[PDB]
Ligand binder design. Structure first.
Ligand SMILES: Cc1cc2nc3c(=O)[nH]c(=O)nc-3n(C[C@H](O)[C@H](O)[C@H](O)COP(=O)(O)OP(=O)(O)OC[C@H]3O[C@@H](n4cnc5c(N)ncnc54)[C@H](O)[C@@H]3O)c2cc1C
Ligand SMILES: Cc1cc2nc3c(=O)[nH]c(=O)nc-3n(C[C@H](O)[C@H](O)[C@H](O)COP(=O)(O)OP(=O)(O)OC[C@H]3O[C@@H](n4cnc5c(N)ncnc54)[C@H](O)[C@@H]3O)c2cc1C
Ligand SMILES: Cc1cc2nc3c(=O)[nH]c(=O)nc-3n(C[C@H](O)[C@H](O)[C@H](O)COP(=O)(O)OP(=O)(O)OC[C@H]3O[C@@H](n4cnc5c(N)ncnc54)[C@H](O)[C@@H]3O)c2cc1C
Ligand SMILES: Cc1ncc(C[n+]2csc(CCOP(=O)(O)OP(=O)(O)O)c2C)c(N)n1
Ligand SMILES: Cc1ncc(C[n+]2csc(CCOP(=O)(O)OP(=O)(O)O)c2C)c(N)n1
Ligand SMILES: Cc1ncc(C[n+]2csc(CCOP(=O)(O)OP(=O)(O)O)c2C)c(N)n1
Ligand SMILES: [K+]
Ligand SMILES: [K+]
Ligand SMILES: [Mg+2]
Ligand SMILES: [Mg+2]
Ligand SMILES: [Mg+2]
Lengths: 585, 585, 585
């Protein structure tokens, strides 16, 4: 006749297909804990060592599977620790439910221990943000939170006074609306608009197709359009892998977490097809300053004309639209623009390979990443932290449509490497999972290496130990007048940290050590997590946004210094290739 | 060459097709004022007498036309006065841009005169809420605010430091994205779900179709489905008029701003098709406690299964889905359920007509509304305030698809009568416009009667003067132990208020006075606004939510008392008609 | 035994001595209404016609008496209407309790009618901002709100789910802490700091004492210090009347709501004693750019050195410190600086008298204010709206320590005239009360003229009808490139508005009409409210911040034009008087 309200809440989560959720208990959330305890055979609580890791892992769950991620924190400090993960979910627009403990309704507003008005804490981050005040409606409030988080692709937060989940409510009244769930309708491309878009693209002298993760279902179409029309491809960094990196007309991404060919080509392009893309550097970097026509395809009206004025804007699904373009075009001959870009890409890839292929000497990030490539399965998943690793992984990982990679794309919170890998291994136990992290980022969430151990999650953790916030040191080099500050720090031996949490580990500092250590790690990670602490040099990775290679633009001295510092003696500027094929820069 | 940033901002508004905008100047917004002053031919500034009326009028603009409404207020108190209209826009989910003055950037954060951090003021109400800090990006920020308000169907607020719009910016850089704006092309309604939904509806013994304003494009289909299938129609109050009130199987709305036949039928129905509907009383009133199967059609995933456990919920457009159902069904013969409902409606309408058709004696609301109907053009627009007028207008106005009516549907702010009528006449100068308001609500925004005069907007204002907050008095009668309080007050003669603002007006207190006064008003309003102050009795309108007519449910004494108080001697309960056609209650 | 929680709440208000409170009922606050209804003998509920007037009146109660003001609004729009008065209370740092209705706990978070999370609405304005969730603790939460509002001199807001006040709670448990309330006993002003401050002040060649309302208890000391030491006095505008306006060495206030002698002297002064003063124009106007030494006395550490670099800042009570200074000084002979200032003041007052003393012709603000002075009792209270009236009243009213005057000092919300006068008459039924308001501000709250009638509050309302937002028109003249906009509008006849609310009234447009109309009004207001609508010219009042009188600073042409426009042919610049008594400018 009755059910505990907390039991009904857990049943709502189960109806919505939640397999696992993260948090740390406290008195103020012990009645939800009690309900979880009874349901342990049907829904799986993962106890993390810091609640930020639970929030980041919930966000990562949703990034990976599209299923709402679920986390919780106890009253006060338990919940405020969630923040970096909740802001990640908001900014990366993925559904997350966060439950926050609160004192019982009989003590709220008494200024009792750790008791505060918690609702204003979450107002900014959350799409939906409510304090529950009744047990009978609590299942509905949770259901509402989930349904809104999905519909609005963001964070729903419910503060739950601890007395409510221990109250009996009528067993027959509550329900979940999971049964009724659907994903948003996919809008269709207007036929005439797409024909006009196609005509403009085909009349271009120096076209590019520039896609983001909105085109994640359209890899086949992107690559075929590129091949058929002889139009190079470039992407946002997160969209790496949608088209295989091997594809010879894939230029990479622009700006800083970027590849040289993409920056150079974008500056020359006359027509850009911007599809499923919300590149946040568009305006501030003047990326499209010299673009003649700008063609946009996006499913979200809020994005149409956002990043540059459009000449044709199509409010439609990327794959449907790109398919419709492909269906109305035929094979075109090579052009000078096409060949200049192909040559530039080959030159760039030879540079990257030269860095990877060193066989002995002081270890650099580049060889560590080659060693990752050498042990990587074709459907591996990469959880990447924030810093130089985004830049280096973007250049060196050899991804295909079978891979996934995630980071904190826009909020760019450090520390996500560890939680993202925890989430990945929970969702895909049979796929290989890497955590690629700098030392600064790994430090921030290091304690949750213990969580990988506790749940026997066989992540391959690779820490890039430069004893620096390298990404920031380079920024200070670029902007600051006075000496470096806060960017070089003491060593932490992550192989000893790993030992401390009872994880097998290695530390390496020479290129020649890589093959055997990575082979051992590959094997250990058939059953248990492992960590490789790669002590790397302080070499700055080549700044794709600050090239000094073209004599029409840089002094011979600056060019020589750039080539020496970046081992870039064999890199040519795009203008070399433009000139070979008869085009002006 | 250069342009003032303020001039560019006004050009962004013009690009988006903003015809008119409302506000009151102040030093802190005088640079936007300056830009408006140069653009009088292309954009029409309406100076209101209180900023809440500007905000409510902006919301009403969007309710009526679907185009973003625009309002502003000066720093501090100018902007906080907008709140009731901004919350109306949020809750009625219509796009509104609000500009808020702010001190110049050189004095912000100095604690100078009327200078405060204004951003937190608007955080709750707004979908987008930013303080501008640069002139060159100001046109983009306004463009972004508009594009988000439309995309997210809510309020965008921009706080503008007064120095920025007077700064020169490059003439060639700014743009508006109005040219990208479009509406989505949707796929066909999900074929197999619609077919299954149809079977469940047709199998029902006591079906109802219960629609809201999400079905605004589907009036034809709703009426044809009803006629063909012999299924009565009911609606939310705001959806009155989508199907003509005359339609014999239109039951009205449920709850309190409601009609008897709808409440009675809903309690008996076995299957409800809930279409384009977010009825907020669903759960609290247990409206669907008896319903066996609950079927839904809605465009928004956030609504699927929201208001009741839903057997089939189709994510689709209402009109397309209802047309798809109509295309797969055909004539059903009249059923007892159909005939019982027809009879019940006829009885109810006879009751309402008996109230309307009194010819002499103390004036009641009922005859005032009959007099409105007698002078109303077939495409009249009605701006309705908040209180008993919603209840009475819902019962008595004879609307068709050619009419529009608006109120504050969900936030339910009093005072909207006046601003809604201002907005209606500005958008539709050739259509007759009424403002129907209680004395309490008309009092709140009375000063803006002067705005109708100043802009020669020929609104027909009808004030229902009962010297009460009648809607609240009746609530106190129902719930309060102690004497009435705050609900009966001293007369205001609105004909004298009208005279004070130089508007022609009349005061009436007898039924026999109505025809000549309403004829005069109809004629005056060919050229100028007019006000009729109708002094009405304190009679409580029949409570459709507290019927005492069925001898199986209520004592003879209770029924006799109800019939006496509400002049309802000839009303029969639905059970009488159910029994007449051979159905149990 | 038990008590209704609402009844206990009202007993908490009574314990704290709340005489009267303002608001408008609604379903969502009807349980508090019910408790008020049983307690009419002990607490007096004032039903206003717009909730902003309730909030502004609550703030004014606290401004006048130092006792917490209390207001309420129903859920949603009832409460958001409070905002302009709540922000006034925050910015004028006076204690106010605001109660906000909310849906019952069983329907919160169901998205039911007018139900929303109300807590974020009030977060910015409020010192304390909570949603009650339990009946038994509700009296404590109200008690806490009051105690914090007083302690922190600001707004406490409590959102009350309507079910709670109708629940029984144990009669013996609740209490109020009013019995604990007291004011602190402070140590002596810091002896050595006061002695040093005194030496610096006395060593000055061109000293000024510049006080604000923190010196409200120190009028006697200020005047005696000035007389004994031959140091002129100037004040903030709100501190007008602390020293009688008649005092020959009272210079007035600085900036725009200002008097010529204060602006001129401040620019020359070498030492300023800044007492109980938080003048918000200090930095933006560079008021103290020439000042050699800046001395401060303030009670609040947050103010020490805030407005200018301060040589000596004494943390102490103003009256005690000024008395301590007086006790260690003695007579100084008249100085040239003193004599120059006396002469300057005399010249200025002759100018103002020349404006006042016109006997016939087109009515200006100046003569209306003379007529006010002629009927004013010596202990009159003035509620002043926002606009030119601040400027004109500051110049023309002849105040003494027996008067009070209030406006919205810092938030500067228009519309406060009416509510401030309502509050004044409720607190002081035996004192004469004026509401001095511009037409724009009176328009905003005009409906609450009916509240004066309903409660028989004999306010003398004087509306200055220029058919402009004059204060803003003059700003546009000064800053705007393009034509005036939004600042000139259509007449409202407030004598007819008054007739509509059943208040006796007069409209005048000629100087010679004033004496008889003001005498009639004075007599009417022995028993009932009255309104005088004074139709005044559009003449710009002399801008004290833009003087053109000194031939060393301004061209002869500029001076001739200034003298012509402002009827200022006989005003002399301060330099004339400085030279007369042998000082350089
Ligand atoms: C340290 C760091 C540095 C970085 N720097 C760079 C950098 O230098 N260069 C770089 O490229 N990135 C960089 N990023 C990432 C960057 O911040 C942005 O997140 C990224 O550029 C945006 O990628 P996106 O447009 O693919 O994704 P999103 O911003 O998520 O946009 C997706 C777009 O697709 C649309 N969409 C979604 N579904 C569909 C559909 N079915 N059809 C059509 N449209 C659809 C959406 O409406 C949206 O507009 C960095 C990240 C980190 C952590
Ligand atoms: C004083 C007062 C009292 C009131 N009391 C009552 C009352 O007793 N009874 C009553 O009925 N109303 C009442 N109301 C109104 C009530 O508060 C709600 O606003 C109303 O019932 C909801 O109407 P709705 O569902 O039509 O509109 P909305 O709440 O706006 O919902 C529209 C729905 O349609 C969907 N939709 C939109 N477009 C489409 C599309 N193209 N296809 C499909 N779906 C779509 C939306 O997603 C949404 O779910 C009152 C109003 C006032 C002022
Ligand atoms: C339309 C309009 C225009 C205006 N323009 C002007 C203008 O041009 N000129 C002008 O002068 N005003 C003007 N004002 C008012 C202005 O905004 C400020 O409110 C005012 O100048 C500040 O006055 P104050 O310092 O007396 O009061 P507050 O700002 O309230 O400061 C009081 C100070 O006294 C201190 N204090 C309190 N008690 C004690 C104690 N016992 N002992 C010692 N210190 C104590 C406080 O800590 C505080 O620092 C205008 C108002 C309006 C409505
Ligand atoms: C939590 C957090 N703090 C600070 C930053 C700013 N930030 C971005 S990159 C970076 C340096 C990352 O250092 P590390 O993880 O060591 O990577 P490296 O660049 O040295 O390989 C910092 C501090 C951030 N994004 N997130
Ligand atoms: C601004 C605002 N304040 C209060 C309410 C609560 N409320 C809803 S109906 C009503 C009474 C309306 O009175 P009136 O306009 O005179 O209409 P009547 O019911 O007397 O016809 C009130 C106070 C509200 N919705 N909006
Ligand atoms: C509610 C509000 N809106 C706008 C302002 C900005 N403002 C300050 S003075 C003023 C004009 C006041 O006009 P009126 O009351 O007619 O006085 P006048 O200057 O004409 O005598 C305005 C709009 C304000 N302070 N408060
Ligand atoms: K940590
Ligand atoms: K008003
Ligand atoms: Mg590092
Ligand atoms: Mg009324
Ligand atoms: Mg005026």
């Amino acid at each position: 006749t009755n059910i505990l309200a907390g039991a009904a809440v857990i049943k709502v989560l189960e109806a919505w297909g939640v397999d696992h959720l993260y948090g740390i208990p406290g008195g103020s959330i012990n009645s939800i804990m009690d309900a979880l305890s009874a349901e342990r055979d049907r829904i799986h609580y993962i106890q993390v060592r810091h609640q930020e890791v639970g929030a980041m892992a919930a966000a990562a769950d949703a990034k990976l599977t599209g299923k709402i991620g679920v986390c919780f924190g106890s009253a006060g400090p338990g919940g405020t620790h969630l923040m970096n993960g909740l802001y990640d979910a908001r900014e990366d627009h993925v559904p997350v439910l966060a439950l926050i403990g609160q004192f019982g309704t009989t003590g709220m507003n008494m200024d009792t221990f750790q008791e505060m008005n918690e609702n204003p804490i979450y107002a900014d981050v959350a799409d939906y943000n409510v304090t529950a005040v009744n047990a009978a409606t609590l299942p509905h409030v949770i259901d509402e939170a989930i349904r809104r988080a999905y519909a609005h692709q963001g964070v729903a937060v419910v503060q739950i006074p601890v007395d409510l989940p221990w109250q009996q409510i009528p067993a027959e009244d509550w329900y979940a609306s999971a049964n009724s769930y659907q994903t948003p309708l996919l809008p269709e491309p207007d036929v005439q608009a797409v024909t006009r878009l196609t005509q403009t693209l085909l009349a271009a002298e120096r076209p590019l197709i520039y896609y983001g993760i909105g085109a994640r279902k359209a890899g086949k179409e992107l690559e075929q359009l590129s091949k058929t029309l002889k139009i190079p491809l470039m992407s946002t960094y997160p969209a790496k892998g949608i088209v295989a990196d091997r594809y010879p007309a894939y230029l990479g991404s622009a700006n800083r977490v970027a590849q040289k060919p993409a920056n150079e080509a974008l500056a020359q392009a006359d027509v850009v097809l911007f599809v499923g893309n919300n590149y946040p550097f568009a305006e501030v970097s003047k990326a499209f300053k010299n673009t003649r026509y700008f063609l946009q395809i996006d499913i979200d009206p809020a994005k149409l004309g956002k990043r540059h004025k459009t000449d044709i804007a199509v409010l439609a699904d990327a794959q449907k639209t790109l398919a419709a373009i492909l269906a109305q075009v035929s094979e075109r001959e090579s052009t000078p623009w096409w060949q200049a870009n192909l040559a530039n890409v080959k030159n760039w890839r030879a540079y990257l390979a030269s860095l990877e292929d060193k066989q002995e000497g002081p270890l650099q990030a580049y060889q560590v990443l080659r060693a990752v490539n050498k042990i990587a399965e074709p459907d591996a998943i990469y959880s990447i932290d924030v810093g130089d690793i985004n830049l280096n992984a973007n250049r060196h990982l050899k991804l295909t449509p079978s891979n996934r990679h995630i980071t904190s794309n826009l909020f760019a919170t450090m520390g996500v490497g560890i939680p993202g890998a925890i989430a990945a291994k929970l969702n895909y136990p049979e796929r290989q999972v890497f955590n690629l992290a700098g030392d600064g980022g790994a430090s921030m969430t290091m304690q949750d290496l213990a969580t990988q151990v506790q749940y026997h999650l066989p992540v391959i953790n690779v820490v890039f130990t430069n004893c620096q916030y390298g990404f920031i040191k380079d920024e200070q080099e670029d902007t600051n007048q006075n000496d470096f500050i806060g960017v070089e720090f003491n060593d932490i031996d992550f192989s000893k940290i790993a030992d401390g949490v009872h994880m097998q580990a290695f530390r390496v500092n020479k290129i020649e050590q890589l093959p055997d250590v990575f082979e051992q790690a590959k094997a250990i990670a058939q059953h248990e997590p492992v960590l490789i602490d790669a002590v790397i040099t302080g070499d700055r990775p080549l700044p794709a946004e600050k090239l000094r290679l073209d004599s029409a633009m840089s002094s011979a001295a600056d060019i020589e210094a750039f080539k020496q510092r970046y081992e870039a003696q064999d890199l040519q500027p795009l203008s070399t290739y433009l000139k070979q094929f008869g085009l002006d820069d």
